[PDB]
Amino acid sequence: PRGSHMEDFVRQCFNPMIVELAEKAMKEYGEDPKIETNKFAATCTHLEVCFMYSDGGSKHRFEIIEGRDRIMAWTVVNSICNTTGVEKPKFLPDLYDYKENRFIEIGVTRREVHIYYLEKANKIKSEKTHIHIFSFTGEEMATKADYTLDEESRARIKTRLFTIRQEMASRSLWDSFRQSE
Amino acid sequence: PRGSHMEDFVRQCFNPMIVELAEKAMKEYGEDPKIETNKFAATCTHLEVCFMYSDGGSKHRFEIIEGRDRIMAWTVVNSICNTTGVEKPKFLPDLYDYKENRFIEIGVTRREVHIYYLEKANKIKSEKTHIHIFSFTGEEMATKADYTLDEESRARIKTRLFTIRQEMASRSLWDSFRQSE
Amino acid sequence: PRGSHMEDFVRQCFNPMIVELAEKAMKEYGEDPKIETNKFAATCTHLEVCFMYSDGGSKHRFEIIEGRDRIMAWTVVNSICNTTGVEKPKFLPDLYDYKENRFIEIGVTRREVHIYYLEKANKIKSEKTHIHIFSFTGEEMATKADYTLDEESRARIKTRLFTIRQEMASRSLWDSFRQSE
Amino acid sequence: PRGSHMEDFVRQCFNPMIVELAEKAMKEYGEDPKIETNKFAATCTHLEVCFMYSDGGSKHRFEIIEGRDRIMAWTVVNSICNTTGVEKPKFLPDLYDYKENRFIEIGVTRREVHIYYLEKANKIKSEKTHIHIFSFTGEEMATKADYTLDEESRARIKTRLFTIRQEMASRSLWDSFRQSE
Amino acid sequence: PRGSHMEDFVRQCFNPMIVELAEKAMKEYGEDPKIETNKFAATCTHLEVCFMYSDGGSKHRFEIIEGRDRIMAWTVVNSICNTTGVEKPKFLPDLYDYKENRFIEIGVTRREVHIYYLEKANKIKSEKTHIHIFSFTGEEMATKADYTLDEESRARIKTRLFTIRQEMASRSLWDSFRQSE
Amino acid sequence: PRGSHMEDFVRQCFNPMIVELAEKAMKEYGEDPKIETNKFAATCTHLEVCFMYSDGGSKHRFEIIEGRDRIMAWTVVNSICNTTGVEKPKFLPDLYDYKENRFIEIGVTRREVHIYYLEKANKIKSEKTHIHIFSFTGEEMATKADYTLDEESRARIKTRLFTIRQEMASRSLWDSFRQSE
Amino acid sequence: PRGSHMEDFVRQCFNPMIVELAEKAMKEYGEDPKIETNKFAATCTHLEVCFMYSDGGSKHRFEIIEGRDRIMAWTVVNSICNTTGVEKPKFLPDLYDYKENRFIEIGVTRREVHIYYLEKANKIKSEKTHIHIFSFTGEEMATKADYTLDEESRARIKTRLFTIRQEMASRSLWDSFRQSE
Amino acid sequence: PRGSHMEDFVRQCFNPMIVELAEKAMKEYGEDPKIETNKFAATCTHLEVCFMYSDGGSKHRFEIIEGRDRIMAWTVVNSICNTTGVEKPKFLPDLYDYKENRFIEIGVTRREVHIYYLEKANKIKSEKTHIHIFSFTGEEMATKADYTLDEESRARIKTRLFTIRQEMASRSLWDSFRQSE
């Protein structure tokens, strides 16, 4: 047994569906949520942001790729590629935008948004995949200064992120989380 | 007992409400889902596309004729005809469009959309009934190049169709399904 | 016991919430649904039309007065009058339109819409109350040729009304219902 | 035991979620709903108005601060301030408007709206916090004559307030409630 | 409007299903729950006791006659009589005991149980109908000193009755209720 | 369209799960509930009696064979036979009794129970299958005078049957139902 | 903000209904669950044990006094006393046993059961109130060596208590909890 | 992708809760349900049998150890051992019997029950752990000829097992499943 304070916080911070999907994702890659508790908190956070993000558009606008098992995520990507003609990305994206006709990679970072976007931009070769970074201090950075959603939908995310930061802080979990990325 | 791999795939591929409605439809016409398993898969697919399609418009836009028992489908058609003045079609359509004021026949084909539309166009005498064909490779073809719904709503359908194709393929069921139309 | 075929049809034709509200309305006025079965069918129909009607606008557009007990319906009317300055009507209306700022009296008739509107127009003294008649043959007639809702929302109602007519007919209940108004 | 007629009216007037949230709020400040029954009725009313108010905008428009425990309300305020740059208010507001980028203090008064707005305006130092007063007679008063929501959304609130007034009156509870502010 | 304190207490004292069934019962006999508020409280109480009583036996032991519309209550009585050979009672009973093979009339009184049993015993001619009286002070009296249920099941009822008495008292409603029988 | 009064009565008499299972059973054998309305009423009745019957024993006592598709009913029979050693019956039974270790054929008749039991006894060759007949007048007849369940569980069934008889009668449907067996 | 590891553990250890009832109980006595976190854990534990305990008897055996607001707990006690003749206890008990006709005070201790029973026995003057102590190491001690429930029902409680002990230990919360009584 | 016919059968054969728990169990041990499809079918079967088994006793009789994550299963075992004094087993058991005070290891085999019991008996050192083997042909074998449950509860399991065998057979999956143990 590990008995982590972070694990208990994550289960009280996030809704059960988010917790369960992150748990399953971590296991698919051979990570244990009871040990890699910072990663447990990060994947739950990233998932909520993706779900909040997809809720921001018009109905039917987004295809959610994140939150699926590896095989099924790539299946939906293939159907999207084979029906829209977009090139198949080399790395799994997070969403697909049926309005702008491009995949979206979403990032959540405890560092400056500019340095995380650099990393993801270099990692992904598919220059077509749109990148959108959010930070725990309320900054965001998006490819071509195109932020996809309107201001209010993005502001919700930023507010939620800062609330998770505080909840972590009041429990003395933030410092360990911050210096873990 | 038949014990079909396709039957089990259909029950895991489609949601129970779709499965049940297709089962009932097939029986109304004296077909057994446990034997005519390709038809089982086709009617479930066609139904989902119709439901996805009707979800694409503004609220109240569409009347769903598909997914009802024969007698009740013709009842709703009669009320539609007797209240809008449109001519009564000779063959049951799939939807009615209260915005464009016309019935819609929806088709899903494993062949080239152009050859399936030809068949349906000649079968139906009511030239007023709007035709919309979708293919399992992402093509679509609609009467008068009028596609009724906006791009994103149609792209969802095309993506879903290609996902069913893949799911069938990974189980070695696609070839039998394709060469069955 | 009465054991009416119409009573059983009404309970299978309408959803339980509509049936229950009409039953309660009829009793409040000292009418028995098991005897006055035509009135049972009429009040259920009128209620569904009112609910369909109120679903036709933008969110928050309509206040539903029908489907409440007498005392509470007049309470909501008073609050509406005392907050919008509109004159208090002499007879209970069916809805209030927050967009057009007027009460709506809704009518459903088995006769020509023009003769039913005449009756309601003369009955109500409050010339401000907007009148909207629907018929079982798909006609409608509204004060000042102002039909409040857009075409599709009204077409749904007309289709539903003609479907109830048919359902009644196939059971040989229509003739008795028609020649009862 | 107190056995208040007002307490029983409040539990039949408001929905359980509203009652429960007000009960919890009152206790957090060391007030007993079974004794301070006018305050019980007021906080339930204020809460419903806030929830009705937040339902009036576009989706994602408002952040609801009211209806949370003290510590969590200030947490969401901090995240809002730390992500939008708005100054942190000295007193807890009721909502945040992501469209207009300002906090909203909502007031419900049994006096003239003009005298209650004066009080709240002087109490709060943060001149940025938008003030919106509703009265039990259907008047409203908002900072800069900017009423945030469109007419119909505000008219619903005014109607609901006058309905609570009547419900109180028919039980001879209004006079005590009015002369308690 | 009547605006009764008793009416509001009844809706907070009893569960909605009990309230609704009593309301419907009272209307079937041309009584208004908003005026005859003592009768409103009495019929709700009597109903709860009957339901508690029927929950006291083994599964399938009791047929609940109370809580049905007049016509259906007499229908179930007829089926019981026509299948068990028991004589048809002249007045509607409250339950039927499939173990002891007899109808049960249940009484709840604010007077001495002995004087209420006398009344019911003389009212009913069918000496076969078993009588069981409960009082608001915890006394009970049953035909032939046969109390049907075991002690604990009857003690629950007595406890619940005294709790309703107290709830009424703390609101100064008991005296009016007591001196109303 | 047929528009039967019996069809509407059946849908108001029986619970939706019973109606649906009977509908499906009738179709599996190529019968239409909208035409063979007496058979519709009979199969619903028989099903309810079987479900009531299986609810009469101790938990786990009965295996319900009725209410399944043909293929699955015979599957459960085979597992029962292949695990208890009982001989496989030639005709589908209604239940299996794990306490008495025998299949049960349940019958509901509008004639004298003695003449219906004769028919079923001669039809079935498996003398091991226990027979239990119920009548619409409250009589019952069981193999070897062994009635499996205790008195109260059987009395419920008899009461329910006579209630269906009355409900049919008050609608002038009984005579046609009776003279149809 | 306090941000306690114990608080988060309690919300993941106990079911929401238990957490909520304990939170409300603590506030009624002017204790904050966010600060007095050991008491938060203790009251949740005690509540679960009481609910498990009451689930151990026959149906209707126990009246649950714990888990109610102070005023209502004493109301049910009064009805119990005024209907069974038992003397009214000076301190709120946890249950009432309708079979043995006595109140039960339940205790959960981190010390030797014998020393906690001594304390409760001296605190309560009503020698009639039955005492039942459980320990976190699986010991129990009951008045007159009468343990009310059968062995299996008590063993469940003991197992659950030791599981909470372990869950606390694996998080390094046990030592602080133990040395807090 | 694997696309197994067995995988699809398992998801249609077992209820979602059973499927999900087995999936999670298999992953905890580094097995993939999409590849080890026979093991997928076996663990689902074993789980259902355990749940059926635990449903066979009196309420509170059994503690279910199977169907939990490794760490929590051993936690409940420790609490059971530390509260009943039973020796801690070396290998995780399936249940604990509070009536007979012993752990139960449940086995399901496609071979002769006698050879599987031999294996489990030698594997486990704790001679105290009670062993109960079920076969897919309806045989069972239990330690000391003590079968814990009464006949009917065990017969249900045997019937269910043979039904899974048939369902597998009709799909030509049985032979591969049988020759896999």
Ligand SMILES: O=C1c2c(O)c(=O)ccn2N([C@@H]2c3ccccc3SCc3c2ccc(F)c3F)[C@@H]2COCCN12
């Ligand atoms: O989708 C992602 C993913 C992102 O989309 C992302 O933005 C950042 C990081 N990711 N990774 C996520 C992840 C997601 C969110 C926060 C941290 C991590 S850290 C690695 C990891 C992930 C999932 C499970 C797991 F066990 C991991 F170790 C992996 C990269 O491989 C494709 C899926 N994926």
Ligand SMILES: O=C1c2c(O)c(=O)ccn2N([C@@H]2c3ccccc3SCc3c2ccc(F)c3F)[C@@H]2COCCN12
């Ligand atoms: O509505 C349709 C229908 C279509 O709308 C359609 O587009 C293609 C094909 N259809 N047919 C559907 C159907 C639907 C979808 C896929 C395949 C089939 S193949 C024949 C068949 C259908 C339904 C039940 C059944 F038993 C059948 F044999 C029948 C044609 O008679 C009117 C209803 N209908």
Ligand SMILES: O=C1c2c(O)c(=O)ccn2N([C@@H]2c3ccccc3SCc3c2ccc(F)c3F)[C@@H]2COCCN12
């Ligand atoms: O609101 C209506 C109402 C209408 O709004 C309406 O359009 C036509 C007719 N109405 N009446 C409805 C009614 C509604 C729909 C169809 C038929 C009837 S017929 C009389 C009656 C009604 C309700 C209960 C009852 F027992 C009745 F006898 C009464 C007129 O008194 C105010 C309420 N009300």
Ligand SMILES: O=C1c2c(O)c(=O)ccn2N([C@@H]2c3ccccc3SCc3c2ccc(F)c3F)[C@@H]2COCCN12
């Ligand atoms: O948010 C409010 C609040 C308002 O927003 C408001 O508009 C008027 C009045 N308020 N107060 C509310 C309140 C809200 C609605 C109606 C009356 C009261 S009267 C004092 C009181 C409140 C909450 C609990 C409690 F026990 C109280 F005594 C307190 C002021 O401290 C911050 C929270 N709050």
Ligand SMILES: O=C1c2c(O)c(=O)ccn2N([C@@H]2c3ccccc3SCc3c2ccc(F)c3F)[C@@H]2COCCN12
């Ligand atoms: O069943 C009862 C009934 C009893 O069973 C009973 O015990 C006492 C009294 N009853 N009556 C109940 C009733 C039940 C409980 C408490 C008070 C009353 S007072 C009259 C009344 C009743 C129902 C509706 C109504 F409008 C009434 F005026 C009527 C007597 O006519 C048959 C039904 N019924």
Ligand SMILES: O=C1c2c(O)c(=O)ccn2N([C@@H]2c3ccccc3SCc3c2ccc(F)c3F)[C@@H]2COCCN12
């Ligand atoms: O199980 C029964 C069955 C009985 O168990 C029974 O007792 C009487 C009669 N049965 N039959 C039932 C049935 C059941 C209840 C009332 C009438 C009927 S009449 C024929 C029929 C049945 C089912 C569907 C259908 F379309 C039918 F025409 C058929 C006999 O073939 C095996 C299944 N079955």
Ligand SMILES: O=C1c2c(O)c(=O)ccn2N([C@@H]2c3ccccc3SCc3c2ccc(F)c3F)[C@@H]2COCCN12
């Ligand atoms: O019922 C109990 C109670 C017990 O029944 C008990 O066994 C031990 C202790 N109790 N007390 C419980 C309690 C219950 C369980 C564990 C610790 C505590 S510690 C004090 C406290 C309690 C409740 C709220 C609160 F804020 C408290 F400070 C109070 C004693 O006043 C009557 C109610 N009550």
Ligand SMILES: O=C1c2c(O)c(=O)ccn2N([C@@H]2c3ccccc3SCc3c2ccc(F)c3F)[C@@H]2COCCN12
């Ligand atoms: O509990 C069991 C278990 C049994 O109880 C059992 O009876 C037979 C076999 N078991 N094993 C089960 C299992 C259960 C049912 C059918 C086959 C298997 S095969 C190995 C395996 C199991 C679980 C997950 C997994 F990935 C596995 F490879 C493992 C042995 O390690 C402790 C848990 N466990």
Ligand SMILES: [Mn+2]
């Ligand atoms: Mn991703």
Ligand SMILES: [Mn+2]
């Ligand atoms: Mn990402």
Ligand SMILES: [Mn+2]
């Ligand atoms: Mn069609």
Ligand SMILES: [Mn+2]
């Ligand atoms: Mn089509």
Ligand SMILES: [Mn+2]
């Ligand atoms: Mn009206």
Ligand SMILES: [Mn+2]
């Ligand atoms: Mn009208």
Ligand SMILES: [Mn+2]
């Ligand atoms: Mn506020």
Ligand SMILES: [Mn+2]
């Ligand atoms: Mn405010």
